[PDB]
């Protein structure tokens, strides 16, 4: 009826603001937020030391209806609009807890399985995934090839109705907890272009020859279980194949737009969270007989940060609106992923600076936020690549 | 029904794009775009030498219905909506012709008169204005005080029911071709703050005392007749007072947001032009066998500008929509003005650079768009002031 | 004895600072400064309206001992060291007067002739240039390419002992007042790579077929006469050929390091100028009960500008001490050229901002400085080419 | 002889380059680089798990002459000029091992003692600190005040010739290992400003009431034992007081230039390391049938980076030379600490990107460099306070 946009809101993270949301979305958001305050934030520090979140926190997120929110109810998901899905990405961001990998799981893997899987595959996976009993992961990057997809060597050869898979992936989110992993492999070692020789497989924990590697020591996402996967002559039945044979690259191209929107929103949300935290810190930090928020350099530094966050938010919210109507193209999503991910980092740099030396301490949220932010301009295709795609329609007009 | 957003358009300027416009608005845009291509661009380079546009080009746009577009029809205006008006700003910016002080005429002066004037004042001014016969300008800035209000000394003292006006003003747009000018003067040197002692006055070309000063020699807007004004003992009738006495600042407060949104739209629009003008140019510029557009670096710089231009566009239309609903608070207005004008300049700079040496010759459109862009971060309040304002809500909880 | 660096200096433009200079140089500098305040500044106002400067001031300069300074005395030059010629580039930059093409004339045109020329060409023109009678220039860029390295199409085919020249040039400094103009042509188009099919010819005002296009209308450098040059069939004796035939490129190469170190020192010197001009303005511009120089944001903006101008100056000074020792490679010089020139612009953008409206008036020195800085990033080889050149040793191992 | 400057050396880290060094300096540099490769690098990953290095590495360092390098030989140190002390800083920075607090020990603590101590204090400490058997630390910062000195609560009430020290410190380098701590306390509460009521005190491990707090958990400098200290009614003998009573501020001010120059060189050396580390990585990273270094963009990002590193190195070397001559003032020193440190982070960010996703893995050096670099723009005084000091000489006449 009379909803406010972020610039005008009391706090960038307030509830019931931004035009793309309805009052039902508001009610949902308040509960998702309660959920993070109570079931996630409290245990996060321990998962960090642990290297991954608990299955128990997944099992609950599912019983609560936070997993597979944009997945069709008649397909096994909870069945909400896109806006309801983003509320989950955003609220997780706002809790500044990066351990839970619900997004990779809910917004990516599940979409691949429902948008391109057999009636059987969907029936078998989707339900467990929504309940959080079956955690999802997707592995496409390899030691050698990450930006040059046309050069990844993981392969799958037919041996009757079966597919024998060999290879290894790296940097796989949820890699440790993963029960089902959508593996990207070369099936046609002789297609004209490697973009017509890739297939997708639903590999599972339990298959002989599926070896999960050591959990990666990173500078951020301390609670995210990023790991390596190895495949040693894994015999996959016919049903392991996700979608049509050799159509692998095609299914991907169609899902990337959403994988990037997801990142873009997460990053700008992260930015909003950092901004209210820091604004807070400097308004309570005594200095020179008053607070640091009284300093003009600080006042303008905060003005520049808020402006860039609201301006960008506007564009991401604009993108969410489009993807809901299924009119979000590759280039567009790319612009959101890239800018939002670069800003997230520039915001963090300045927000750690305003905390002074406490911003370097792990006990303060902003420290986590800073190293957590550096991954965003990298995965989902680096920003360099984002520009390649964006420039396509610019210089090589159809 | 269904429209594309700037990112996916074939050109950031095509008509029919942007979700905030109707099929009708496009017809009007097609026509205004037309007006500028024939009635303006051809003669602009000539007006540049003259230091001002012709009163003829003004009148044409008058009858053409390009003035007072957002001014209510029953008040002497063409009675359109905010968007229709925005179109006008945008098309002129797209023409790369900064001479016509059209925007300040329709968007600021006329709005001041209708929103705050009285019956005679409205029936005596608007028509001549909507007609393009009685040009307008607004003067506030002074030699010693722009960003400061306790710094202006232009004043008016009562003598019965008349007002004797004295002082000067500088940097006035349409200063030379103006017929009516809204002067800001002090009328109560006793008010605690100058915000309680300022009034608005409608001075008309021809009044004894009113003097048109030197046409300032600027670095850009070589066709805008930016001048200086003098008021030597002018006896103004009680009819000149616009609004209550000592309420002037309160009105200026209400109108600034529209001044800032305009400049913002004009700013980003100006960027949208430079992009295509530069995209196209480097696509056709032969070098090393192919064109310069085949250089990856040129491809990325190009992606960078488009992303920034598109992300800001989204925000500016966000602000047009809010203002159409008369729900655009000052802070948001300021963010628009500040970030858009700023972007405009780092875009104008890169675009020149991609135009190599020729981006330095006045023959090419970009060159002038560069020196024209530099004035945006300064008027309507310097970007520094914008930040002061946007920081108010961040730090001072009222 | 003791000497401070720019940071410690009272003003950045103080005489008697920077390790590389001696009292010897200091006396000559005060000597040169005087020349610019008394013989250049006074008339610049006018030359900007004539597009070109007076032929007289050039004779005054030369007679005075400014033209031909790094030019050895045994060949008709003042013979001073590099620091001496540097002092001339700098002082002019400090004068904010860009009309005089003194630097291209005695820093480039005179080196070429005396570095690869016959004892005839030397005796014949050097002395007349040093005197300020024969104004020199050089042309290599054409409307088709400035960076192609072969985009040059102006050819020079032999006909006995006298060469027949043919082609055209663009963006030529000292274009109109040019008595002599070195030209780069294709003497052996059959060459493996055109870096071997180029030669140099000393075109002289008067030769039949040597036409001079009119004054180019530029955005900045107003009193700098830049025009196009044509060659419609001129018979040139066996003397016009400078150095060897087809071994011409080797020359352009061996002198480029110096053209670029020149622009560098200029850029940073103009930057040292703008800083002090702007610091002066702020310290006296009243605002909010005290000077704008009392605002913390300004104080900080000023510190960023000083630090960069100081960090860089040091580098340019380092590049000077190296060049004085004939050991400044292409790469090092390019760096100084790339960074100095860019910095000059950012410094210019911020300096204008601190002047407010007034920074956009041709009245104020900073205004012309702004547009006169936009050319450095472009000429002497664009900053992009500077990057190509620096990248080589980085990536492609020698 | 013919020493080269960084822009022309094979590797910015090659020994034998940069003009401020001598053949004996290079001989020393090989010795130290070697020590870091043998005694430090190999054990660092374990010290990282521990949160502090071993005392063994210290006693080693001491024995091999790396501690107290620029301290007077007759005073207990090992004698030697600044350039030699700079090399120990730089080399450590080149080993990318921030664990050992050798610099804060030799570059700061020892200097405070040998510059203002007593013949008794000097004799009792330097010897043991040179042997690395007595590790020192500096403690000024307190939880509620790090920039505002007017707010440090640690105090010492005089009692006879005794001092009763109470209070606490936080963010203290070598805090855990610390054998001697230079604590800054308020000795005169009713003083005119707080800059006249501060004394320095030599607090030693073993003093009753000197409790070492816990090691702080940071985002970087994982092997640096940063802790918080407490002073509980410690009765310091009169020999505990360093220098004149209440003149503590004066000693600090005198030393600050060296502390900021040190942080600065450490920064630019880390950048030199990172650049070379990344250049190397892209040359060996195969992508698209070629390397990452074949892409034009990577080439320019590399040229840009190298240019800023070579330029900031030029300015930093100049500071060392100035400091060797004892003519390095506050401002110049802040200038280097502020810019070098910000650049270090900019450089670290782009080097992580160029490493793709591997730059986020702790296994890779560039990852340590990233978090390890974020601390420099903060300690030694924040970069904002740096600007404050630089901005002093600009706006307020001496
Ligand atoms: C913690 C973490 C989580 C991640 N999660 C997943 C996941 O779950 N599943 C998965 O498969 N991957 C994931 N990744 C990997 C990530 O998607 C890849 O790192 C990224 O897509 C490509 O980087 P790369 O590692 O392949 O490095 P490369 O691709 O070898 O190098 C990339 C860099 O090289 C340069 N570059 C590359 N191509 C170009 C170009 N064409 N033009 C200009 N420059 C170019 C730029 O520096 C670019 O950033 C994750 C990574 C991390 C670190
Ligand atoms: C081409 C052109 C057309 C214009 N048209 C009009 C017009 O038609 N009518 C009209 O009246 N005016 C107009 N102006 C004037 C313009 O609005 C003023 O320049 C502007 O409002 C204030 O700038 P100033 O020149 O007064 O600078 P000042 O106010 O003297 O100084 C401004 C600068 O000081 C510093 N500054 C000032 N205050 C702060 C602060 N609070 N915090 C941090 N920094 C601060 C910043 O450097 C800021 O940029 C125009 C100006 C130009 C150049
Ligand atoms: C006022 C003025 C004075 C000048 N004086 C002289 C003079 O005295 N004599 C003379 O001969 N010239 C002079 N010039 C011309 C100047 O040297 C050229 O403009 C400059 O070398 C750029 O070449 P260009 O103008 O042909 O632009 P182009 O080379 O056509 O375009 C340059 C742009 O294209 C892209 N680009 C080009 N090459 C590359 C690349 N290799 N890699 C990545 N990007 C690239 C970048 O955007 C680059 O900025 C002057 C120019 C001006 C305006
Ligand atoms: C790991 C590490 C090691 C360190 N080692 C030492 C050590 O050995 N000994 C020691 O005592 N300290 C050390 N420190 C502490 C460091 O020196 C201080 O944190 C720093 O000097 C001030 O930080 P603060 O948090 O107290 O600043 P705060 O006052 O909490 O906040 C500072 C920030 O507020 C703003 N601000 C503050 N003042 C102004 C101003 N006046 N004008 C404009 N903006 C301002 C800026 O954001 C400034 O950066 C170290 C810190 C860390 C993290």
Residue numbers in the entry:
A (entry chain D), B (entry chain A), C (entry chain B), D (entry chain C): 33 to 430
Can you quote the paper on this entry?
LCAD substrate specificity overlaps those of VLCAD and MCAD, and in addition includes unsaturated and branched-chain substrates. Here we present the three-dimensional structure of human LCAD, revealing an unusually large substrate-binding cavity not previously reported in eucaryotic ACADs. The structural basis for the unique substrate binding cavity can be seen in the long E helix, where Pro132 is located in a position to cause unwinding of about two turns of the E helix, thus creating a large cavity.
Structures were obtained for wildtype LCAD complexed with and without acetoacetyl-CoA to 2.8 Å and 2.5 Å resolution, respectively. The first few residues at the N-terminus were not resolved in the wild type and E291Q structures. In the wild type structure, the chain starts at Glu34 (monomer A) or Leu36 (monomers B, C, and D). The C-terminal residue Lys430 is observed in all the monomers in the 2.8 Å structure of the wild type protein complexed with acetoacetyl-CoA, but not in the 2.5 Å wild type ligand-free and 2.0 Å (E291Q mutant) structures. In all LCAD structures lacking bound CoA derivatives (all eight monomers of mutant LCAD, all four monomers of ligand-free wild type LCAD, and the C and D monomers of the ligand-bound wild type LCAD), residues Ser179 through Gln182 in the vicinity of the CoA moiety of the substrate are relatively disordered in the absence of ligand. His228 and nearby residues Asp180 and Leu181 are highly mobile, judging from their weak, diffused electron densities.
